[PDB]
Amino acid sequence: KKVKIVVDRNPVATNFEKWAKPGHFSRTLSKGPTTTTWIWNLHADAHDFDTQTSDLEEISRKVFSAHFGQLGIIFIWLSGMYFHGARFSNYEAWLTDPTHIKPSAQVVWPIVGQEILNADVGGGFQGLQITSGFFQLWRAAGITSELQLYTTAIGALVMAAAMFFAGWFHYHKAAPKLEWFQNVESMLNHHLGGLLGLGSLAWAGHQIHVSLPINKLLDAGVDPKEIPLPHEFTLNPELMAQLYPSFSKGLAPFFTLDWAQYSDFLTFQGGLNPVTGGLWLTDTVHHHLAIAVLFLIAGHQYRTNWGIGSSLKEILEAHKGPFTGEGHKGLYEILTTSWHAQLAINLALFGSLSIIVAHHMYAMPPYPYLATDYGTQLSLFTHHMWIGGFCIVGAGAHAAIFMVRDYDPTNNYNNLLDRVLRHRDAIISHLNWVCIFLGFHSFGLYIHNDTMSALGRPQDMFSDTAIQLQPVFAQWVQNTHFLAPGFTAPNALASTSPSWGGDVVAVGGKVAMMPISLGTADFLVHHIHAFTIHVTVLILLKGVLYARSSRLIPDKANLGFRFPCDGPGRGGTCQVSAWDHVFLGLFWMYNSISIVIFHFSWKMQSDVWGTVSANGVSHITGGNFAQSANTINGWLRDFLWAQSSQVIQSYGSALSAYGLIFLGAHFVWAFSLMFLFSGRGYWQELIESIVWAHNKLKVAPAIQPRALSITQGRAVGVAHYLLGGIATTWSFFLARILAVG
Amino acid sequence: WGAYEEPLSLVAGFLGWFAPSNIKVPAFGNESLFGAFHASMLENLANFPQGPALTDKFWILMITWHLGLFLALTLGNIGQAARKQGY
Amino acid sequence: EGADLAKVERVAKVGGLYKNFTSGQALSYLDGTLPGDFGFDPLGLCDPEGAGGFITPEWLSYSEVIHCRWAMLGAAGFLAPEILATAGLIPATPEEAVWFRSGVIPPAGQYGKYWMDPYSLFWIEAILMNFAELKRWQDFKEPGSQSKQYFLGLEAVFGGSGNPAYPGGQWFNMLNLGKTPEEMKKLQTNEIRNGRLAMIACLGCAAQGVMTQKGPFANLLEHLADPVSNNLLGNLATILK
Amino acid sequence: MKDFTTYLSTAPVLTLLSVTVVAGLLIEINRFFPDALIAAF
Amino acid sequence: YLGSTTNQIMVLSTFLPLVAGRFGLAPTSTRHTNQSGIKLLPAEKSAGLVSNDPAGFNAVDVLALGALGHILGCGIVLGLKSTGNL
Amino acid sequence: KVQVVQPVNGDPFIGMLETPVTSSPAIAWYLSNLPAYRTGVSPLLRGVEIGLAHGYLLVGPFIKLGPLRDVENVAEIVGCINGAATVLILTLCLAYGAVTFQGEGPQVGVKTLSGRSIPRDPLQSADGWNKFTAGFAVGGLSGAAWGYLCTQILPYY
Numbered sequence A: 001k002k003v004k005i006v007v008d009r010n011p012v013a014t015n016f017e018k019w020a021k022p023g024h025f026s027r028t029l030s031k032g033p034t035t036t037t038w039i040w041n042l043h044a045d046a047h048d049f050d051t052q053t054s055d056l057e058e059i060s061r062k063v064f065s066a067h068f069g070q071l072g073i074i075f076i077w078l079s080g081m082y083f084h085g086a087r088f089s090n091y092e093a094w095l096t097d098p099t100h101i102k103p104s105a106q107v108v109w110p111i112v113g114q115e116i117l118n119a120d121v122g123g124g125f126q127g128l129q130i131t132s133g134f135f136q137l138w139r140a141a142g143i144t145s146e147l148q149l150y151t152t153a154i155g156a157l158v159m160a161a162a163m164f165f166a167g168w169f170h171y172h173k174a175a176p177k178l179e180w181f182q183n184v185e186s187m188l189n190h191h192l193g194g195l196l197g198l199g200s201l202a203w204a205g206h207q208i209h210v211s212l213p214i215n216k217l218l219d220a221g222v223d224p225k226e227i228p229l230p231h232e233f234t235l236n237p238e239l240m241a242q243l244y245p246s247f248s249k250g251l252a253p254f255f256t257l258d259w260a261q262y263s264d265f266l267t268f269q270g271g272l273n274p275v276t277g278g279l280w281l282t283d284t285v286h287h288h289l290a291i292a293v294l295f296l297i298a299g300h301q302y303r304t305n306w307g308i309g310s311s312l313k314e315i316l317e318a319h320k321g322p323f324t325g326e327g328h329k330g331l332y333e334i335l336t337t338s339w340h341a342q343l344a345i346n347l348a349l350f351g352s353l354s355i356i357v358a359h360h361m362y363a364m365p366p367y368p369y370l371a372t373d374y375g376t377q378l379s380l381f382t383h384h385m386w387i388g389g390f391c392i393v394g395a396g397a398h399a400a401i402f403m404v405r406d407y408d409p410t411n412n413y414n415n416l417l418d419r420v421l422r423h424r425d426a427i428i429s430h431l432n433w434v435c436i437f438l439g440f441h442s443f444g445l446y447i448h449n450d451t452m453s454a455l456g457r458p459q460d461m462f463s464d465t466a467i468q469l470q471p472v473f474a475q476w477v478q479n480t481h482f483l484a485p486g487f488t489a490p491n492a493l494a495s496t497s498p499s500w501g502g503d504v505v506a507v508g509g510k511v512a513m514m515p516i517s518l519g520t521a522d523f524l525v526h527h528i529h530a531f532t533i534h535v536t537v538l539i540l541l542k543g544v545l546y547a548r549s550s551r552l553i554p555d556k557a558n559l560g561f562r563f564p565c566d567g568p569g570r571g572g573t574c575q576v577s578a579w580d581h582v583f584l585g586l587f588w589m590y591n592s593i594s595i596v597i598f599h600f601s602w603k604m605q606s607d608v609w610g611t612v613s614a615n616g617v618s619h620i621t622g623g624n625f626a627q628s629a630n631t632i633n634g635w636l637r638d639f640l641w642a643q644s645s646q647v648i649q650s651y652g653s654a655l656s657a658y659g660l661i662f663l664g665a666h667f668v669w670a671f672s673l674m675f676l677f678s679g680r681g682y683w684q685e686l687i688e689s690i691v692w693a694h695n696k697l698k699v700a701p702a703i704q705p706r707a708l709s710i711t712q713g714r715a716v717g718v719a720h721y722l723l724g725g726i727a728t729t730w731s732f733f734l735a736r737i738l739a740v741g
Numbered sequence B: 001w002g003a004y005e006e007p008l009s010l011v012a013g014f015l016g017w018f019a020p021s022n023i024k025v026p027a028f029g030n031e032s033l034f035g036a037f038h039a040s041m042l043e044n045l046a047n048f049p050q051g052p053a054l055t056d057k058f059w060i061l062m063i064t065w066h067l068g069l070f071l072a073l074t075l076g077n078i079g080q081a082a083r084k085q086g087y
Numbered sequence C: 001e002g003a004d005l006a007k008v009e010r011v012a013k014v015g016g017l018y019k020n021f022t023s024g025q026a027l028s029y030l031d032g033t034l035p036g037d038f039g040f041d042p043l044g045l046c047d048p049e050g051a052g053g054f055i056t057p058e059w060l061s062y063s064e065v066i067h068c069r070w071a072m073l074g075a076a077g078f079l080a081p082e083i084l085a086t087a088g089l090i091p092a093t094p095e096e097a098v099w100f101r102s103g104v105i106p107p108a109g110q111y112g113k114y115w116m117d118p119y120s121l122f123w124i125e126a127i128l129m130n131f132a133e134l135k136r137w138q139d140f141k142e143p144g145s146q147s148k149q150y151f152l153g154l155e156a157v158f159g160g161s162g163n164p165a166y167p168g169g170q171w172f173n174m175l176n177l178g179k180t181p182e183e184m185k186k187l188q189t190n191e192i193r194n195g196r197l198a199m200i201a202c203l204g205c206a207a208q209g210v211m212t213q214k215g216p217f218a219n220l221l222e223h224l225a226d227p228v229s230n231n232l233l234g235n236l237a238t239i240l241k
Numbered sequence D: 001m002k003d004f005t006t007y008l009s010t011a012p013v014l015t016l017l018s019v020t021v022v023a024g025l026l027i028e029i030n031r032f033f034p035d036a037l038i039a040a041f
Numbered sequence E: 001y002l003g004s005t006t007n008q009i010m011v012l013s014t015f016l017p018l019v020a021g022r023f024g025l026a027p028t029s030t031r032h033t034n035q036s037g038i039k040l041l042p043a044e045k046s047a048g049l050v051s052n053d054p055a056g057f058n059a060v061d062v063l064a065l066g067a068l069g070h071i072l073g074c075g076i077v078l079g080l081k082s083t084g085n086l
Numbered sequence F: 001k002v003q004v005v006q007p008v009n010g011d012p013f014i015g016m017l018e019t020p021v022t023s024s025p026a027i028a029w030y031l032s033n034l035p036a037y038r039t040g041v042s043p044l045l046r047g048v049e050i051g052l053a054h055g056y057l058l059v060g061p062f063i064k065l066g067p068l069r070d071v072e073n074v075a076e077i078v079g080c081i082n083g084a085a086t087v088l089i090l091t092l093c094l095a096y097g098a099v100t101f102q103g104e105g106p107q108v109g110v111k112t113l114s115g116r117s118i119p120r121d122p123l124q125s126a127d128g129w130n131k132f133t134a135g136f137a138v139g140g141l142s143g144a145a146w147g148y149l150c151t152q153i154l155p156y157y
């Protein structure tokens, strides 16, 4: 009772005694490295704190310190980004010409002819073209000078040192107790208002006193070296008033509830800025202020040290109906004592959020000169899509882990979890049927179109000319959003994004955003996406639901979460554990995300990105998506074969690296096949023969070489498969977009 | 009810017989949500012969009115059968 | 809980508003032993249960006393130059004698007539304060130390006492004020109250300087001339002008 | 100090340091003696 | 600004929740509601708060009720001046 | 306080549950009144009804989607296509009956949900399936034939 700061003093001594004893955290790794399997086991269980100790307090302390270390690593990475943008970039020159100078923040040394990678980006600078979008972010923040980037890099280094010190201090000096970690009410109250709300309010303040004036002058047209410094605008209401007249009144309108006076810098316009092609910074300021107020208000719902507030346990236990028996009872105990359940929920929502971010960012470019940078747009979208997919797969994996280790039947009786586990057969069977139906009605349509096209019967295909499959619902929603301003949003001057419809927003002769028409090809690709997502969900859900027991193996929970099988009996139990379900879900997630990014790339290159010549829009691919994306042959020829000429012809130029990785990735992927179609027995016997050869020359090692375990073989195969495929797509996308963008 | 085991009690007619009393209130613009929906229903064909074209005022009005009616119906049924939210 | 009646009675005798902000959790450890103990701790920071790091009753009380003394010096230093300049005693204009224009914040103004530039002055300041603060910290860690190692003969007055916040030896208590324990407790209460008032005053001076762009004495005089007009609400229109 | 030197002598640390030293030596050899197609002595 | 319609609305909208919570009409730090949310439960003093008010109206009650009243008053004032009235 | 989900016939150790989708009064009545769940009706008549419905509903797809859908003679071609599909599913029914019913065995009894003993469905027999298959052929072919007539008649269409 009573939320407070409870901490234990000096729990772990600081020394290098355990650094010289690898495998000290695990009890099973104490007999020493008798075989090579010990080396792999040392790394496969380094972060599995649940196995290193049975105490939840120690596990929580380890997680907290690991989080601090991760924060320090991220800060080091950020510092490196800012330092490279301040010392090995053309940001200052790019500011004067953001439409012709290609951003670059990496310079290579001349050693073995690699200096060819230093492309002629522009502004008297040579380097590698970057697609992270840091230049646009810095411009939106009003960096302008390189000294500010250097200062930010130094500050990031200081923050990294602070994070590492915090982790060491919280693990060896002042370690929080278990009751401190279980304060979900206090944690939520602080993360909602003190973190998200306060951060949004602070960013809004910076945007008001730094981003708005500097960016306004830049857009109006003023040399970056002539714009006043940020402090000259943050501490001088006269100049800022010269740029925004509502500031001549100070803070009086805010406290008198006459907020309308602030309508000059707190607008609700919409669309994009015609000069930069991005969202109106005033709109973003207003958005951040509104969400900050909302988050601050939301950070006052849970009860802590006072009577006011709500109880998570009380709210959960009060939500029970006639179809769910007991209801949400027991969920609070699960989420307050199991780290894997929280990790699963957080990973799922985190990945979904990343995907939503990718969508909202290409639809509504939030940074200046970002939409016209096709390379940056495609790179950001694809990167966030992959991060989201990986996080979702991890969420499923941790859900299965919790179901295998932290599940307790005595605490989950007749509740949501128990009832779900009591009818897993119906869920899995229905999901399997919907997956089969989607696969048929989605892929068979493409196969039918291919067969008709090959048979000389284009009138029997599922296209916009023959049997039409118009997405009436999507088109209706799109038109509804287009007609929203002045009707279902009277205070809105334009739609959220030009994709809903309207005019074409072009910046510097290139189309920044334009309406995206949906046809039969869009209908087909959307159903393909739904089918792939459903199959991935089926695999992950099946693993989570059958991780404990199954009709084939009634004691699967006893075998653990990660085991290769249960022998060749019962016909075969290969890949029956939850870990194997995650292993297969990774492949399906890769397939789904790959199709998603391919669809996005082709659609933007055929119906969005292009040039304006006062006579129309000349798209990159000429709009061949609407007439070729309805068949697999079109995707293979008009997209894979047609757009791959940029990466296979990059030798001898700056993009040659993309041509090398493109091949290297192809190798790694194929390499994975060796570990995916093979078994452990063959390699063990081959190693036996090689060991005999070594013994014949008295060069056999004491650490008996052993073939990788079945689980390790599967992990290596899946890791190499995804690395090769993702890297191949990365090289192809980057080379193509950097050569035609 | 006469058939099934539908918990939709007959006394629960207040859902659908009370939602119009609130949706008919004018919203400054136009004249009223239900009024506009009914006018569109009676003008843009008797929702059976030809059709409401593609993305018309009738479509959004019908979707919004049905959204409100359905949410009121289900929430009221849950509340009434829950007996002062005894769950 | 419902408080403890007897424990709340002690806080009630303190008078003022010290009762509407007290709680049963704070009264479990705030028994009036420390000077200035008025039973105010809604967040329960000085709770001895689970204490560690810098969030400990000893460190928190020591930090409060240190802040009190530093704030008293700061408030006196914030008001003395402006008051002396307003009366013409020193050859500095009232707008130039403001505390935030001495050189602490060059953007807000600086006095460029010192015997040496402010950065080098800060270098000397860092060395001197490093010596003083490090010796004080080591005494806090080990009370018996600081009086053993040779320090030009000054170590003889660094023995300290049981309480780190009250060394009061041959130098820190020259006049030997507060000879009896009750008198010392009363004087400690005076010091704590004055330091708290000085802390509040320093924060107020900073806020007024940011919102009025003038000095504390000037703000007080302008408020006295016209209180209804010159105040927080009346100055909302012009904050950094 | 003994434990630190023992940790520095572990297989991963020694492997990374050896690879870094060999790579650095090769890079400098190619920097001072570039385009060595054949062994011209 | 003092004595204006906006000032009167804000003052009233902030003071009303305070008097409501003091006379057992609004939830406070001692009296809460059951799972229904419309039935005030008897005053419980498990939070350890102390106040000189005869009814036990603590300072946390002042802060909570004042914040809620301020939010409601701000919304009411903005809606009134953004609709033509006020 | 009501629990709409109960174990099948009160037994909680049978791989089935009773939900408002399976044990619904109207749903149960409609599902029980289908020709497939008529233990007392002759299998031939039930097969005739099933074949009629299936044959009638099977013309439409080829009519509006067949290779010759854009020709005036699409109705006839589709009638023939449905006849062929009915004959195919007919041989399917015969093969299933010849493989499933080829031996005898003292099977366990059959009771209702209340516990009233009932004989096994005559359809689950060598002669029962043959009669059902024969009725499906006559009904299936008749349904396809009626599908063509409806195209010629039906003033709206």
Ligand code: CLA
Binding pocket: A012, A013, A014, A015, A016, A017, A018, A019, A025, A061, A062, A063, A065, A066, A068, A069, A070, A073, A164, A165, A166, A167, A168, A171
């Ligand atoms: C010089 C400071 C120092 C020292 C001497 C120690 C010493 C010790 N720590 Mg500790 N720790 C420190 C700082 C330090 N720590 C900091 C800054 C943090 C916050 C992150 C932690 C958090 C921490 C935790 C949570 C735990 C320990 C534990 C331990 C004990 C055994 C584990 C161990 O060290 O194995 C050796 C570790 C290493 C040799 C290095 C670990 C791997 C690093 C962190 C990876 C960095 C990533 C890097 C960028 C590479 C990734 C990318 C790459 C592929 C390119 C040991 C006595 C463990 C313990 O008490 O045992 C039960 C325990 O669980 N520490």
Ligand code: CLA
Binding pocket: A063, A064, A067, A068, A071, A180, A181, A183, A184, A186, A187, A190, A191, A193, A194, A195
């Ligand atoms: C307003 C209070 C506050 C704030 C701002 C934070 C902020 C944060 N918490 Mg935290 N937390 C709080 C209260 C707060 N917490 C309380 C009261 C509890 C106890 C119930 C916890 C328990 C808790 C746990 C168990 C964990 C966190 C974690 C995190 C980090 C998540 C990383 C991230 O995505 O954010 C973005 C990252 C940044 C913005 C980096 C900037 C960091 C700055 C310095 C913010 C530091 C705020 C800090 C609370 C200041 C007080 C520390 C002070 C004594 C020096 C984040 C920085 C997680 C973590 O990663 O551990 C570090 C995590 O494991 N918190």
Ligand code: CLA
Binding pocket: A043, A044, A045, A046, A047, A048, A049, A347, A390, A391, A392, A393, A394, A395, A397, A401, A562, A579, A582, A586, A719
């Ligand atoms: C916040 C994210 C997060 C966190 C904290 C964890 C934490 C944990 N996971 Mg998990 N996981 C996640 C996300 C996360 N995971 C995601 C997104 C996935 C989907 C891929 C998974 C899938 C997963 C599985 C299948 C398993 C775990 C397991 C575990 C536990 C042991 C991890 C370990 O020590 O193994 C060792 C860690 C390593 C060996 C690091 C190796 C890094 C990979 C193999 C290399 C990738 C290359 C990289 C991209 C760079 C390429 C360049 C290269 C050429 C140099 C641990 C508690 C294991 C467990 O038993 O749970 C209890 C388990 O088997 N996770």
Ligand code: CLA
Binding pocket: A005, A007, A162, A163, A165, A166, A169, A174, A176, C051, C052, C053, C054, C055
């Ligand atoms: C980001 C996650 C995080 C979390 C959840 C915690 C949580 C905790 N820390 Mg810790 N700490 C962190 C990060 C974090 N810390 C970092 C990054 C550092 C290195 C700087 C430290 C260094 C540190 C020390 C040295 C100590 C703690 C202590 C504590 C414990 C009590 C702190 C407290 O509430 O007292 C009160 C909190 C404060 C007084 C903080 C106020 C001062 C800071 C500077 C406010 C500014 C933060 C804000 C984001 C700045 C915004 C910018 C500004 C311009 C407005 C507590 C459990 C103490 C402890 O061990 O308790 C037993 C302890 O002594 N922390």
Ligand code: CLA
Binding pocket: C068, C069, C070, C072, C073, C165, C166, C167, C168, C169, C172, C173, C174, C175, C177, C178, C184, C187, C188, C189, C190, C191, C192, C194, C195
């Ligand atoms: C009004 C504020 C105030 C008050 C009431 C106290 C009270 C006390 N202080 Mg403290 N002190 C203060 C401010 C204050 N101090 C400030 C601002 C600092 C920072 C420099 C210190 C630093 C300090 C230290 C380091 C120590 C004390 C100690 C003490 C205790 C010893 C008794 C005493 O001397 O009484 C105080 C008497 C007065 C406040 C009246 C004097 C008021 C005039 C204006 C001061 C003039 C001083 C002037 C420079 C004299 C120069 C010549 C002089 C030597 C003859 C006592 C309870 C000692 C202790 O704890 O004893 C065990 C001790 O170790 N104080």
Ligand SMILES: CCCCCCCCCCCCCCCC(=O)OC[C@H](COP(=O)(O)OC[C@@H](O)CO)OC(=O)CCCCCCCCCCCCCCC
Binding pocket: A319, A320, A321, A322, A323, A324, A325, A327, A328, A416
């Ligand atoms: C296209 C829509 C995207 C979602 C995919 C839908 C397919 C999923 C079908 C699986 C159903 C499984 C039945 C579980 C059976 C089940 O969960 O038990 C019944 C469930 C339990 O409720 P209780 O009465 O127990 O409530 C107490 C709760 O607090 C505890 O759970 O109540 C429901 O009816 C949930 C609604 C399920 C139906 C969801 C459909 C919602 C319609 C959304 C339409 C969106 C588009 C139209 C908007 C205009």
Ligand SMILES: CCCCCCCCCCCCCCCC(=O)OC[C@H](COP(=O)(O)OC[C@@H](O)CO)OC(=O)CCCCCCCCCCCCCCC
Binding pocket: C014, C015, C016, C017, C018, C021, C040
């Ligand atoms: C988020 C940032 C905010 C930080 C808040 C957290 C800090 C908590 C500090 C609160 C004090 C704790 C309890 C003190 C308890 C307490 O008050 O102690 C009582 C106080 C101090 O007196 P003593 O300590 O000497 O008490 C002993 C004697 O009073 C015996 O009876 O006396 C007063 O009444 C002065 C206080 C008046 C308040 C001054 C405000 C004057 C401004 C008037 C403005 C009028 C118009 C306003 C319009 C805007």
Ligand SMILES: CC1=C[C@H](O)CC(C)(C)[C@H]1/C=C/C(C)=C/C=C/C(C)=C/C=C/C=C(C)/C=C/C=C(C)/C=C/C1=C(C)C[C@H](O)CC1(C)C
Binding pocket: C040, C041, C042, C043, C044, C045, C067, C070, C071, C073, C074, C075, C076, C077, C078, C098, C099, C100, C101, C102, C104, C198, C199, C200, C202, C203
């Ligand atoms: C009690 C409690 C309990 C619960 O539970 C919790 C809580 C809430 C946390 C609490 C509260 C707290 C508080 C109130 C705090 C505050 C503080 C302050 C204000 C400080 C200041 C403080 C302040 C200070 C130190 C100050 C100082 C000052 C100074 C040095 C100054 C200096 C100077 C001078 C002379 C002059 C020149 O020309 C400038 C300079 C150089 C600058």
Ligand SMILES: CC1=C(C/C=C(\C)CCC[C@H](C)CCC[C@H](C)CCCC(C)C)C(=O)c2ccccc2C1=O
Binding pocket: A674, A675, A676, A678, A679, A680, A683, A706, A707, A708, A709, A710, A713, A714
């Ligand atoms: C090749 C192969 C092996 C043999 C592979 C072994 C024994 C691993 C060899 C690793 C050597 C010792 C290190 C090679 C170092 C490389 C230059 C880089 C490796 C990357 C590491 C740093 C992680 C298996 O054991 C196996 C098991 C199950 C299914 C498939 C297979 C399989 O395909």
Ligand code: SF4
Binding pocket: A564, A565, A566, A567, A568, A569, A572, A573, A574, A575, A710
């Ligand atoms: S083939 Fe391998 S995984 Fe499959 S049952 Fe045999 S040992 Fe197990």
